[PDB]
Amino acid sequence: MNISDTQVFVALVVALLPGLLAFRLATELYK
Amino acid sequence: MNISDTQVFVALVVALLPGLLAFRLATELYK
Amino acid sequence: KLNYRLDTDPVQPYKGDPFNSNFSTAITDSPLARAFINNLPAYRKGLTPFMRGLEIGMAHGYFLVGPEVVVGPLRETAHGANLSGLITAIYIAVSACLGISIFAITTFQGDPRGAYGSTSKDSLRPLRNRDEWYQLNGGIFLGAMGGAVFAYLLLENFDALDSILRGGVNVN
Amino acid sequence: PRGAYGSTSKDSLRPLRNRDEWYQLNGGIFLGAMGGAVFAYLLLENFDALDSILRGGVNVN
Amino acid sequence: DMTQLTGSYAASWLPWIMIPLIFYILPFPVFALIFIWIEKEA
Amino acid sequence: DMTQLTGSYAASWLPWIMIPLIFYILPFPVFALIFIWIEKEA
Amino acid sequence: TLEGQTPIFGGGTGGLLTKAEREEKYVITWTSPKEQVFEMPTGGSAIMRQGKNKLEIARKEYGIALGGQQLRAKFKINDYKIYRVYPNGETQMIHPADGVFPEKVNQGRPKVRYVDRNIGSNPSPAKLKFSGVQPYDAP
Amino acid sequence: SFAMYCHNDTMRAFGRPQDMFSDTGIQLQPIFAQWIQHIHTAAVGA
Amino acid sequence: SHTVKIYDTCIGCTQCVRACPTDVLEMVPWDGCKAAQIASSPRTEDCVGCKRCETACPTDFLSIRVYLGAETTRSMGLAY
Ligand code: F6C
Ligand code: CLA
Ligand code: CLA
Ligand code: CLA
Ligand SMILES: CCCCCCCCCCCCCCCC(=O)OC[C@H](COP(=O)(O)OC[C@@H](O)CO)OC(=O)CCCCCCCCCCCCCCC
Ligand SMILES: CCCCCCCCCCCCCCCC(=O)OC[C@H](COP(=O)(O)OC[C@@H](O)CO)OC(=O)CCCCCCCCCCCCCCC
Ligand SMILES: CC1=C(/C=C/C(C)=C/C=C/C(C)=C/C=C/C=C(C)/C=C/C=C(C)/C=C/C2=C(C)CCCC2(C)C)C(C)(C)CCC1
Ligand SMILES: CC1=C(/C=C/C(C)=C/C=C/C(C)=C/C=C/C=C(C)/C=C/C=C(C)/C=C/C2=C(C)CCCC2(C)C)C(C)(C)CCC1
Ligand SMILES: CC1=C(/C=C/C(C)=C/C=C/C(C)=C/C=C/C=C(C)/C=C/C=C(C)/C=C/C2=C(C)CCCC2(C)C)C(C)(C)CCC1
Ligand SMILES: CC1=C(/C=C/C(C)=C/C=C/C(C)=C/C=C/C=C(C)/C=C/C=C(C)/C=C/C2=C(C)CCCC2(C)C)C(C)(C)CCC1
Ligand SMILES: CC1=C(/C=C/C(C)=C/C=C/C(C)=C/C=C/C=C(C)/C=C/C=C(C)/C=C/C2=C(C)CCCC2(C)C)C(C)(C)CCC1
Ligand code: SF4
Ligand code: SF4
Ligand SMILES: [Ca+2]
Ligand SMILES: [Ca+2]
């Protein structure tokens, strides 16, 4: 039994935080 | 038995030769 | 002893300048070729950039529908093939318009490099202003969409148009 | 013009300071909105064909 | 059948397109070309 | 059936939307953004 | 303006491009004792006239090659000059710089980019790390 | 030529032989060479 | 632009100046060699980096050195 719709959506929402932090780190390194 | 598809297309291509020469003569006469 | 025989040369220097990297040939300088090229919408005198873009878009979006209609992967059915052709034309035209937009964005900063600088004398590239490029792009997009839709409507109504052009609508 | 569109106004958020700019804007708004609405309408009208398109169902024949 | 225009001759699709082209598609652009030609300032 | 792409996993419409988005929808805007970034005058 | 008559040439594809009108251009002028055939720097043959000749070119190397390998070496013409022409019309005579050919030593010419040592005494790059100076530019 | 060969490769890998450039798919008949063959055969009376 | 340097081993043989296809070098008075002249590169902006001068230099090691640097329109040898 694989994960459900809610788990996929929760993973997608959680992955936003590393994405934003990666953008912040990239812009800081570009400085 | 009338002419075929190829004969009609050949006649159309051949008719281009007097067509272009007519344009050359008309422009030459306009000079 | 030396006779260049330039006065009797069928091929002359382009516009009287022998050092402009061009020749006066039947393609570049004949009256018919000059008239045809200079009266195309890209070069027609007095046209506003939007009208140039509109005419070019109508023509290009009109003929871009056909290839996927005839030899595309949805060609087994008429309606699907027409939809695929319209979608392909729309995608190509939108990509081209995005390219035109970014070309205008990047070319016109300060004095543009290359053929679009203030001192450039490129007669084949007359759109020297960014606003002209944006008007041209708007015209291109609208005309391309209109031509693609016109071709799509003609192909979707192929049976009706075939009856139309054969007088089959005059039975009743 | 009164308010933020006067000659002495410095409203950076409202840069269209000419009447001709607003009419050019409006022409683009109308034609763009009609085209975008029709584009969405055409995709929804062809939802069954597009669903087969995006699933490879058009490659059966 | 005799309910539509048809052609038993070769390439019967040619009148299907040539008749519209010569009689109500191209003539207006041709008139436009002549109008520009006869109205050009010296 | 095996005549179309399907998914028995949860939210099988997700590939249906994301494959076009990542591979032939967003990439051209991303290329445009990069082109604007690398062509900006100093 | 630069005086001289262009050589007899029917045209070619190796001439000037957008760079000539946008960034810079070069002009080579000379004087010949007679009308004679020479080779254009970018292909083809031209006829230089008896008077003073002026030729428009895209790169300085074209003019240097024409003046040295053809005008001096073959036609024994030594009065050629190369000018750089900018789009705004500003013209500077760049060859020869001071009226004397560079291969002939001339008084008043300063030493430029001279290093007061043999090439084997350049410092190692580890010496100049983060200092921004290259070993050949080191004092 | 070569991109069309690659197209044929990809279409065959997909299991879409009907989309290939072939005698049974999208045909590319060399009609001029066939015509020359026919003329040269009929010239001698065969 | 490229960088052209002349070291004190120059013998004033004028070969590098003659070999240059863009007139970057010239001979200037000097007292460090018998020929009483040394090469100089006042016009390195016109240097293309062909290294013909290095090929023509007879000293061992080279008395003239070319270090390729930032590329410009004329250093890339572009007619366009
Ligand atoms: C790949 C390849 C390829 C392909 C594939 O294979 C194709 C296809 C195809 C198909 C789909 C079609 C047919 C269909 C039939 O048959 O049937 C219907 C018809 C009808 C309906 C028709 C009816 C009548 C009409 C309407 C008339 C016309 C009009 C005009 C246009 C106007 C004119 C204006 C001025 C005067 C000019 C078509 C068409 C085409 N085109 Mg193609 N294509 C290609 C190409 C091209 C190129 C390059 C070029 C040049 C640019 C081109 C052009 C053109 C033109 C003009 C055209 C027309 O018109 C048509 C139409 O759209 O239509 C609607 N292509 N297309
Ligand atoms: C002067 C000769 C002549 C005349 C009067 C006609 C008359 C006609 N042709 Mg026709 N035709 C001709 C020669 C001629 N043909 C030749 C030589 C060819 C082979 C290239 C064709 C191929 C042809 C096709 C394929 C079709 C017609 C069709 C037609 C009919 C409709 C008109 C049309 O679509 O034209 C079409 C004409 C062409 C595609 C090419 C015409 C080429 C000729 C030589 C041009 C003559 C120009 C003329 C001499 C200059 C006039 C000067 C002015 C001062 C009057 C009409 C009865 C249509 C038809 O059958 O409808 C039922 C049709 O579909 N023609
Ligand atoms: C680096 C890890 C990684 C990799 C290589 C893949 C690879 C793939 N994923 Mg995926 N995914 C991941 C993590 C990853 N996943 C995570 C953590 C999630 C939960 C948020 C998802 C959620 C997800 C969905 C919902 C779907 C895919 C799908 C796919 C496939 C098509 C690509 C696509 O649509 O991306 C979609 C990607 C996302 C929606 C989010 C990706 C988030 C990751 C963490 C970003 C990684 C960035 C990377 C590290 C930076 C690269 C730097 C560069 C220098 C290389 C492909 C096999 C599709 C599929 O199954 O097709 C059959 C699909 O529909 N993925
Ligand atoms: C331009 C490149 C090109 C080249 C080098 C060839 C070469 C060849 N073709 Mg070929 N062909 C081409 C394009 C080309 N083709 C195109 C575009 C088509 C589609 C109409 C064909 C259709 C075709 C057929 C049906 C056959 C060949 C055959 C052949 C072979 C015999 C030569 C011959 O007389 O064929 C005749 C070829 C033609 C009449 C094609 C016309 C080519 C013209 C000159 C080019 C015009 C289109 C141009 C690319 C677009 C113009 C751009 C615009 C800016 C002006 C030979 C290897 C024969 C073969 O396979 O023999 C074994 C054969 O039967 N060709
Ligand atoms: C679906 C995924 C699509 C691709 C990802 C998104 C592409 C575009 C993202 C950046 C656009 C805006 C640029 C910064 C906005 C902006 O103007 O920044 C300005 C910033 C600093 O610029 P300067 O130092 O020249 O100063 C100019 C001043 O105006 C600002 O300081 O420079 C950059 O462009 C940042 C570095 C390049 C970009 C680094 C990598 C990009 C992000 C990588 C991580 C992505 C994570 C995604 C999570 C969802
Ligand atoms: C389907 C058929 C549609 C109708 C036929 C085509 C209509 C348009 C054709 C000409 C357009 C461009 C005009 C010349 C291009 C052009 O600019 O020419 C310029 C030419 C010379 O002009 P000037 O002497 O004032 O010098 C101006 C300079 O720019 C050129 O020397 O004057 C003309 O207009 C030519 C004479 C009038 C036209 C004579 C009759 C037209 C041709 C008749 C035969 C047609 C055969 C068709 C075979 C396919
Ligand atoms: C479900 C849901 C939702 C939605 C969501 C979404 C829409 C999501 C998305 C997500 C995503 C879409 C994400 C993404 C992410 C990303 C990432 C995670 C990335 C990362 C990256 C990295 C880490 C790297 C970086 C770097 C650096 C550092 C530097 C250089 C450059 C680069 C880039 C390489 C909502 C809320 C509406 C509602 C509820 C439910
Ligand atoms: C089939 C085919 C094709 C097509 C073709 C075509 C499209 C054609 C057309 C054709 C045509 C469409 C033609 C036309 C012609 C014309 C003519 C032949 C005319 C003539 C005229 C005349 C002779 C007269 C003149 C005059 C004079 C002299 C002076 C005054 C004016 C006038 C005009 C009266 C192609 C190649 C694609 C491919 C292969 C197959
Ligand atoms: C068609 C048309 C035309 C034209 C147009 C144009 C002119 C366009 C342009 C366009 C353009 C102008 C485009 C562009 C594109 C771009 C691209 C495609 C890019 C890409 C990129 C990439 C791929 C990147 C990469 C990288 C870098 C570099 C850095 C960082 C890392 C990476 C890897 C991201 C005209 C007007 C005549 C007329 C109408 C039609
Ligand atoms: C050079 C020449 C030629 C060629 C030609 C061509 C290439 C043509 C093309 C043509 C074409 C390709 C055309 C097209 C056209 C198009 C049109 C005419 C369109 C129109 C459109 C419309 C009308 C639209 C409308 C709309 C809109 C706008 C929106 C809403 C919807 C609708 C749809 C209503 C030939 C070889 C013959 C001969 C020799 C010379
Ligand atoms: C901020 C952001 C975001 C958001 C976003 C959004 C809100 C989006 C939207 C989007 C959209 C909402 C889009 C849309 C688009 C559209 C289009 C792309 C259209 C197109 C169109 C067309 C192409 C048309 C055409 C036409 C015409 C013109 C006429 C005739 C007909 C036709 C149809 C052809 C997110 C949260 C994610 C993340 C974070 C950040
Ligand atoms: S590298 Fe070439 S152009 Fe530069 S100084 Fe040496 S020979 Fe002259
Ligand atoms: S650098 Fe070399 S070639 Fe030039 S003058 Fe000195 S020894 Fe001669
Ligand atoms: Ca009726
Ligand atoms: Ca299919």
Automatic annotation (TrEMBL), chains A, B:
Pfam families: PsaM. Signal peptide: none annotated. It is found in: Cellular thylakoid membrane. The keyword Transmembrane applies. It comes from Chroococcidiopsis thermalis (strain PCC 7203). It is a single-pass membrane protein. Keywords: Membrane, Photosynthesis, Photosystem I, Thylakoid, Transmembrane, Transmembrane helix. Its main location: membrane. Belongs to the PsaM family. GO terms for biological process: photosynthesis. SUPFAM superfamilies: Subunit XII of photosystem I reaction centre, PsaM (SSF81548). Coiled coil: none annotated. InterPro entries: PSI_PsaM (IPR010010), PSI_PsaM_sf (IPR037279). This is Photosystem I reaction center subunit XII.
UniProtKB/TrEMBL annotation, chain C:
GO terms for cellular component: photosystem I reaction center. It comes from the Bacteria. InterPro entries: PSI_PsaL, PSI_PsaL_sf, PSI_suXI. GO terms for biological process: photosynthesis. This is Photosystem I reaction center subunit XI. Chlorophyll a 1 binds at A42, H60. Residues 11-159 form the Photosystem I PsaL reaction centre subunit XI domain. Pfam families: PsaL (PF02605). It is found in: Membrane. Belongs to the PsaL family. Ca(2+) binds at P73, E76, V169, N172. Keywords: Calcium, Membrane, Metal-binding, Photosynthesis, Photosystem I, Transmembrane, Transmembrane helix. Chlorophyll a 2 binds at E55, S101. The chain crosses the membrane at residues 83-105, 133-155. It is a multi-pass membrane protein. The keyword Transmembrane helix applies.
Automatic annotation (TrEMBL), chains E, F:
The keyword Transmembrane applies. One of its GO terms (cellular component) is photosystem I. The keyword Transmembrane helix applies. Keywords: Membrane, Transmembrane, Transmembrane helix. The chain crosses the membrane at residues 13-38. GO terms for biological process: photosynthesis. This is Photosystem I reaction center subunit VIII. It comes from Chroococcidiopsis thermalis (strain PCC 7203). The chain holds residues 3 to 44 of 51 of the full protein.
TrEMBL record, chain H:
Chlorophyll a 28 binds at H40. It is found in: Cellular thylakoid membrane; Endomembrane system. Chlorophyll a 25 binds at H7, R16. Chlorophyll a 26 binds at F32, A33. Chlorophyll a 27 binds at Q37. The PsaA/B heterodimer binds the P700 chlorophyll special pair and subsequent electron acceptors. PSI consists of a core antenna complex that captures photons, and an electron transfer chain that converts photonic excitation into a charge separation. The cyanobacterial PSI reaction center is composed of one copy each of PsaA,B,C,D,E,F,I,J,K,L,M and X, and forms trimeric complexes. Belongs to the PsaA/PsaB family. PsaA and PsaB bind P700, the primary electron donor of photosystem I (PSI), as well as the electron acceptors A0, A1 and FX. PSI is a plastocyanin/cytochrome c6-ferredoxin oxidoreductase, converting photonic excitation into a charge separation, which transfers an electron from the donor P700 chlorophyll pair to the spectroscopically characterized acceptors A0, A1, FX, FA and FB in turn. Oxidized P700 is reduced on the lumenal side of the thylakoid membrane by plastocyanin or cytochrome c6. This is Photosystem I P700 chlorophyll a apoprotein A1. The gene is psaA.
